[PDB]
Amino acid sequence: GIRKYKPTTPGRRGASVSDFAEITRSTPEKSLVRPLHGKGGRNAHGRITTRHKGGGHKRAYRVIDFRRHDKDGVNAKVAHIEYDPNRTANIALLHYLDGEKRYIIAPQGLKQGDVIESGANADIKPGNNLPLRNIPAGTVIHAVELRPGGGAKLARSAGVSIQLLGKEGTYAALRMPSGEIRRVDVRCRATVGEVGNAEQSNINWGKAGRMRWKGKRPTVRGVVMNPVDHPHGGGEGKTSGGRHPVSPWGKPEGRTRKPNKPSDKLIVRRRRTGK
Amino acid sequence: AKGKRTFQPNNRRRARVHGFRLRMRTRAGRAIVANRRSKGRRALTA
RNA sequence: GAGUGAGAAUGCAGGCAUGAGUAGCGAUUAGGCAAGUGAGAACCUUGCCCGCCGAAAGACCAAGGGUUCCUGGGCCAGGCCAGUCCGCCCAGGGUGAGUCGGGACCUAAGGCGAGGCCGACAGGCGUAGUCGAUGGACAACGGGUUGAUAUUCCCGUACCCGUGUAUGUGCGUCCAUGAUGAAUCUCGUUGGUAGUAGUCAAGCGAUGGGGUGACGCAGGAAGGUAGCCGUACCGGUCAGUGGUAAUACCGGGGUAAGCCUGUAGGGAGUCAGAUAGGUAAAUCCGUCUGGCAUAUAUCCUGAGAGGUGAUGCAUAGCCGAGUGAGGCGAAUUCGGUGAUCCUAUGCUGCCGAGAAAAGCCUCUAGCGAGGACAUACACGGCCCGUACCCCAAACCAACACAGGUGGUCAGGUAGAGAAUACUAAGGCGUACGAGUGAACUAUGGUUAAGGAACUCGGCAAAAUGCCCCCGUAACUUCGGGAGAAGGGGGACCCACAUGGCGUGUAAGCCUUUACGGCCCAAGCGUGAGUGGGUGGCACAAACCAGUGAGAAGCGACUGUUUACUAAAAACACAGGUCCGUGCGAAGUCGCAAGACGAUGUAUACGGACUGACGCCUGCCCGGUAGCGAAAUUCCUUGUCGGGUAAGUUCCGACCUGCACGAAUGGCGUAACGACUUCUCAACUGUCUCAACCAUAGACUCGGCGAAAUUGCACUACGAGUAAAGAUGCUCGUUACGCGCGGCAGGACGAAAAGACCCCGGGACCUUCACUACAACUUGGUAUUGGUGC
RNA sequence: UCUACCCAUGGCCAGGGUGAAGCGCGGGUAAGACCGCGUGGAGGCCCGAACCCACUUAGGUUGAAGACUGAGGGGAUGAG
RNA sequence: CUGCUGUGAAUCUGCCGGGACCACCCGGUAAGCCUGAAUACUUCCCAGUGACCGAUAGCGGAUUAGUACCGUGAGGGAAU
């Protein structure tokens, strides 16, 4: 849910926070926690390769089970649902009956004590993870793999999900959270259900302080920058650049995807751009 | 005021930024050491 | 044969002048006297007195410095003066660690990285590793001592690994000593070999694994302790004053780690069976399955109190051995107050969700007929730093420089306080002085009568200022505005008051007999109220300490910004929209590998632009077609008023005609603002209009002692003339020579080879200027087989 | 070693104030939004030191200082 | 003559050069080839020379000289 702050301060006026109502613990699993230090958006060269990144609250990585293949036929119980700093959705600490503990992206509607199944024989219920070959068509899945055994990569953000439109041969058509139609091998695994925490997109962060906590540094506009700094830089007043939009490196707006990619043949219908 | 001068001494940092090991690390620094040795510097480096 | 001739190059070097015996002699504390030393003393020593700091200007750590430390000498350099002195000069001495801070122990960011991958070469990355504290682990505290070191040395008492001895053999051996199924008949059983043979049984025992071991921010409350204030008691003073002989006053009224105990607080179910999930194995962890109680039970952790340590140590004081080194040495009780410290990595809340090594179990394995375990003896178990300075004269600042420099401790009285004032300890008077009522400058102070009339502008100053009672508007996003505004009181003494409150002596409560609870005389602290009275001009009497109100614009807001003239309306921002990106994504850094993005995945990332929040559709949004209302102020809108006596900013109606500018970029918008502008109340030396006082300069004397500038010089004025603005030229006028203190009209004064303007060149920026290059398609190379065609 | 930004690991922020949800209710109420009294202690919250800054003014301007001082001023639990 | 890219020759009736080609011709026998001494320079050492300098010259350096000093550093760099 969402808890809206009262306007006791100018920085809290329209602000809201996650109503952490699905969270069952305030701490992670110490065995599954890993160190995670900030980068500032800087690569191995020390250069800022991604701007507007830095500061931000310290985070600890929770090892997520995106490649859910080892526990094939071994059931788990939803031990807890926990906050994860490193993703918009909540994580679900599972207790595999064999005695192993792992984190997964907490799907929508998952509660503590629920039983989760993995493998072809798993029931089609939220949290269960079985290959697309065994997931029936016209169902809402998430945490879908791109290649068999490669680990979940698609629709793992809070509230997102993929529609398994159909299966033909050794491929399955998926409608992505972006509306794109893409084929992926049926041997790719996917967890059933949506991703939980769907309301998090409605969080109003209220003040610059919240985004500085989240690690987002302020964004300066090119039309404000000088001509040397940005192509939009200059003009007596906040211009629009004197021309159509371009990036700080001069790249104009337009499809930036590289052609001749091997996935061009897998992608059926790309996303609908403002229709 | 803000009367901080440019030079803030630090022996460890001096050694780690201009020291003999750092100079010998790169060919350019080795070149600097050799050039100082040819010039006759008593202090080839920090 | 020339390195052959200088006066110019804002030339170069060295030595000097001119200003000049001139400025200055470096804060906002302050010195004085007596004596000493000495050739010489404002400055050094000693004794007083005075003054300054006292959340430091006291005492330490760290960095940095590097001997500056101590002793003895020196005084021609330095010290802004002098100097006998010194951080200066010279010699000698001085730095003592199992425990402190580091290494020998860990790792974070990051560095380097065997191989390796990538790259024409150079090299770029990077795995394994290995470094890398600012963090983790890790054993010591009091007292004394030196001229200089001290958790280091010494004293006392503590805590971390080994060798020779003794206590037990806690179990097993060459035997015996327990557990296990050891076996026959589309299977069967016990009917043998065969409960023998093997395994575990010992005593111990990872580098290897496997698992616990491990962190945020805020907020109290409680219990303590340090500290502080008293007090029993103890030891002393009479400080030439009116009183004051113990009733008064002054000093003490101390003592650590360790060890013992285990209190307040905090956290905890426990015992079996199974299990490969933790790569193998585990008895460990995890999961599941059960049994029992969830209790004033038990177990961990744990401030503190108490005991010991402590018959020691230390201490007020005592006498005299002034080499002043010595000895002797009392009391030490209770209370109040009380931490920013401890319990506490606790507890509670919250979202922004908070870094491995040792430690402890487990096992595979291992030594081993014993070897090993614990206990008690006597004996042993590294390197580096350690002086000294460390808000400073020893560091960064060229200087003994008004600047900067992280952390720790944080007495008293007022006080909310770490503000502020004054003070304790402690440390200083800090390095030019003495004088002198000049102007003038600066910093303070006061000011009649006015009270913003000053001025671009209330700049500056002045003013409000605190606590408690009341009481608080428009508007609002319902949070605010707000401490709105406005009003009253505040001191001291007495009584209520042997009060109320907080603490807590005993007796009893139950009793588990406790480090127990409740109450509680007394004692000690202590708020506020009421009623009287007292004094003054004044009771937040000092210091400290909001001015407030109304408006207009801009920007929602807190925040950021041109280090060094711009802090803003600019940037940012939360919200919004658009575009890109289906994932070693896009986008960036790279030749590439690779990296960030992100250990993220369209509720996510990047980019662009807006910049909270609210509003912005008219016949058909089937037609002229984007609407014609309104909030829309260029408005020059005049007209009128409001506001001033004259009133800018601005506020209103009437205004303005296809208008005009915003179907999303224009209008509003509470709050906020060192933003811009204005009007008020108050206030004032801003002003009418200035006067006086003090201090630092200025001035005088003594010492030291520059500077920019300088073609010259016994350098007037007038009217002229001149490169058109003359001390230097003309004709006259004036003027004895030389200073000193002032003023700033000229010397087209100094300063900077004008930034303006032009010309020549440059640089950087823009682009549909030219030409190139980085960044994508075509042909064939890599690469290529048939058939259905 | 200045400075801009970022990363790791530490530290600091005197004092005072205001008072953001769940308990019990008078309630509102069929029931709810929600008013009030207590508790709680949030906030790029308020006043205000240290600390950081640098708005105004005066002085400095061959300075004490190649950017400072005095007096005021801003932030002062945070984007510190 | 030669780099890269593609395509790609026989054996002397061959192939290459003579700044196309019949060739009159001439010269030579690449790619698989490989391999020698006899000319430039002076850190350093020895002996010398100068119509070279002679302490602001001559080396930056006759002297503590790449020292003092300056700079974080590369580096700059004296005077005597």
Notes on the structure:
Chain A: InterPro entries: NA-bd_OB-fold, Rib_uL2_dom2, Ribosomal_uL2, Ribosomal_uL2_bac/org-type, Ribosomal_uL2_C, Ribosomal_uL2_CS, Ribosomal_uL2_dom3, Ribosomal_uL2_RNA-bd_dom. Chain A: Belongs to the universal ribosomal protein uL2 family. Chain A: Keywords: Ribonucleoprotein, Ribosomal protein, RNA-binding, rRNA-binding. Chain A: It comes from Mycolicibacterium smegmatis (strain ATCC 700084 / mc(2)155) (Mycobacterium smegmatis). Chain A: GO terms for molecular function: rRNA binding; structural constituent of ribosome; transferase activity. This is part of a larger assembly, with chains A (about 280 residues) and B (about 45 residues). Chain A is mainly β. Chain A has three domains: about 1-115, Nucleic acid-binding proteins (OB fold (Dihydrolipoamide Acetyltransferase, E2P), Beta Barrel), CATH 2.40.50.140; about 120-195, no CATH class; about 195-275, Ribosomal protein L2, domain 3 (Irregular). Helices cover about 5% and strands about 25% of the residues of chain A. Chain A is built from one helix and 17 strands. Chain A has one helix at about 210-215; strands spanning about 1-5, 15-20, 35, 60, 75-80, 90-95, 100-105, 115, 130, 140, 145, 150-155, 160-170, 170-175, 180-185, 190, 265-270. In chain A, the strands form five sheets. Chain A has a seven-stranded antiparallel beta sheet, with no helix packed on it. Chain A has a four-stranded antiparallel beta sheet with strand order 7-6-5-8, with no helix packed on it. In chain A, a hairpin with a 4-residue loop joins β6 and β7 (about 100-105). The radius of gyration of chain A is 22 Å and the shape is globular. The two termini of chain A are about 30 Å apart. Chain B has about 45 residues and is mainly α. Chain B has one domain (about 1-45): Helix Hairpins (Orthogonal Bundle), CATH 1.10.287. Chain B contains three helices and no strands. The longest helix of chain B is centred in the C-terminal third of the chain and has 13 residues, at about 25-40. Chain B is elongated. The chains are: A mainly beta (about 280), B mainly alpha (about 45). The chains hardly touch. The structure holds three RNA strands.
